[model samples]
Structures are given as structure tokens and as C-alpha cells.
Target: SPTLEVDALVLNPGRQEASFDGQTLELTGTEFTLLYLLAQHLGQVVSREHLSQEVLGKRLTPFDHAIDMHISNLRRKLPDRKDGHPWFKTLRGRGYLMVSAA
Candidate 1:
């Protein structure tokens, strides 16, 4: 299986586990896909349509909260950060971005 690394974080595609700063971040299948996609783009903005079609293998519903819920869960597993240094950021009407300084 393939794997992804971001900063000091190592995400195992085989196990759905992300390790960072001596902590393990457990992720669901969906969350793992989302994280992997965003990490691949790094500082670039990833549109919701790409996330849905490419990462999730589906079309996003207008009022769908699935992505929102998964993002919230992913945020909970990441390290705490200052106000401007969030690990995941909502790009307003766009989509999301995954960023970290470590």
C-alpha cells in the first residue's frame, strides 16, 4: 500500500494511522482519504468537487455534512495550534487545505 508523509507526520495507507510528534492520530477510511488528498496538495487549495470525485468517489450533495463531520474529526486528532495555525482550514466557498509547520 502507498503512504503519505507531511512534515513529521507519517500516514499509513495500510492501517489508516497518522503519527505526528509522538502521537498517533486514528482516522477513518473517509478521513484518511481526505487527509491524503489535502496533504498531496499541501499549501494549495483543494476544491470540494475534487475531494468528492477523486478522493471520495462520489458527488457531493449541496447540503451534505459528511465532509464537514469528517474534517471536524480530523481536526480533533491533530496537535493543538495557535489561532492562525490550524491544521485544516476551510477555504470559504472553495474546499479545504491541510497545513502544518512541523
Candidate 2:
């Protein structure tokens, strides 16, 4: 029953669920994995290649935007934090970041 906390967000691996502030986030299986991975590496950028390997269980290939789409969906599902800053940010040519919103 491992639990992870990043900022105000809480992740309970035993339950495979996440809660932001006090509200639950209904995340997909893949989304939960990605978010948990991001939380594990909070404050740093997560490359698509790494995500693809870990979450998708495959290597990153050209013309594959699957990771991008999943990230977008994950972003939409997560509401902004108290300060109006998003919990995630995409860096052009770099990677995605799980940022502190409050």
C-alpha cells in the first residue's frame, strides 16, 4: 500500500487512484500509470520516449502521437489548481512537466 504525494495531489498505489485537493480524479489505467510516473519524477521533465517505454510498453516511433493524445486527455481530466496554474505543462522539443500548481 504505497502512497505518493506531489504538492496537493495524492496517489494511492494500492487503490490505483488519485485525488487532487479533495476531489477524486477519474483516470484511465494508462493515465494513472503516466501520472504516477510523473509524480515520481516531479519537478523534472518527462520525455515521450521514457513515457512510451514505461506506460505504453513500447519504444517511441516516428509519426506516433499516441503519447501526445493520452497526455492531452490526462490534462483535460485534471482541473487547474487553486492558483489557476495547470498541473501539467508540455515543453516544445523537450518533454512534459508535472508542475506545482499551488
Candidate 3:
């Protein structure tokens, strides 16, 4: 099954659908791909270069903000809880890590 259950969210890769609190989420195609990949590697910092290639279908250029925009959209679209563990962790000079429940 290509379905990912992270915290309160359920992502279906086959359908490219994300749901939270029993409701469907709104995410663009690129956003869904980014979220799906990160969730597939939970707790691991997936490199930005990889994301750019996989999501954008091209190499990441200097001073590019495309991937970052999709990430922020993902965070904004997902449920924002006041829990101890955040959903996504941005590692400076490294990559982004998907945060799971404590």
C-alpha cells in the first residue's frame, strides 16, 4: 500500500490525495508529490536537490525558491496543532525532515 498515515493525516499516493481530520486537503500536484516523498522517508532529512529533481522534474538552480514555496504551502495546508512535535523540520544547509508524533 502506498498510503501513508502520519499523525492525523492520511496520504494516498495512488490517488494523490491528502486528508486531515477526516476531511480532504487541498494541495497542488507538486505539493502532493513533495509531501508524499517526505512522508515516505519519515525522520530522515531528504535533500533539497532530490526534491527539486523529483518534484519539479528538473535540477535545482541557484537562488531558486520553487521548492520552498511548495513546502510552505504543504505546512499551511496541513493541520496546525499545538503539539510538541512539529510536522516538518527545515534543516539549514542540509534538507527537510518529516516530523512524526512524539
Candidate 4:
């Protein structure tokens, strides 16, 4: 079972489980995948197209908001932020970035 720990969050890749501060989070499969991908690339920007191809099993299309929706759901689930800032930030027209406290 592969596990990744970032700050107070613990992600178990094998079980597809995620926990924050010792509390397990109830997440959908897509949500889990999205979070896992972001956690794997912490502090780096992940393109929408890359996420779509890898996580959603398809290429990104114009007018598609699926990735954004998934990201939104992830944010809602993990609401905790470091110093009142979001753990993830959206780079408009570019990609998403997972922010780590400095």
C-alpha cells in the first residue's frame, strides 16, 4: 500500500483513501483520483489536459468543465488551508497548482 503524507493529509493510494488530521474523508472515485494526482505533484502545476488524460481517461475538450468540477469537489472536501489560503490554486487558462506551506 503506497501512502503519501502532505502536511496534515494522508493519502493511501492502495486503498484509495484520504484522511486529514486523522479523520477520513468521504470522496468519490474521481475526487480521490484528482486529489491523489495533485498530492503526487505537490508544489507543481498540473495541466488540465494532463489531468484529463491521466485521471479521466480522455483528452480535454473545449467548453468542458469536468476537471474544474472535480477540483471544486476536492476543495469542498478538504477545506483546511494554511494561513487562510487555499491548498490548491487555479492558474487561469493554464493549470492547477497544489500549494505547500513554506
Q: Could you tell me every candidate's TM-score relative to the true structure?
A: 0.77, 0.85, 0.91, 0.90
**Shift of residue 61 alpha carbon in model 4, Å:** 0.7
Of 2 and 4, the candidate ahead on TM-score is 4
lDDT of 2 by residue, 54-81 (tens): 8899988887888889888987887766
Task: Judging by TM-score against the true structure, name the best candidate.
Answer: 3
Instruction: Return whichever of 1 and 3 wins on TM-score.
Output: 3
> Of 2 and 4, which scores higher on lDDT?
4
Cα lDDT for residue 100, model 2? 61
Tell me how far the alpha carbon of residue 98 in candidate 2 is from the true structure, in angstroms, after superposition: 0.4
lDDT of 4 at 3: 93
**What's every prediction's RMSD, in angstroms?**
2.9, 1.9, 1.5, 1.6
Model 1 Cα RMSD, 1 decimal: 2.9
lDDT of 1: 0.76
Candidate 4, 49: how far from true, in Å? 0.7
Tell me the tens digit of each residue's lDDT in model 4 across 34-99.
888888889889998998998899989988889998888887789485456577889888889877
In candidate 3, what are the lDDT values of residues 34-65, reduced to their tens digit? Answer: 88899999989999899999999988877887
Lowest-sum lDDT 10-residue window in model 4: 79-88
Local distance difference test, per candidate?
A: 0.76, 0.82, 0.84, 0.84
TM-score of 1: 0.77
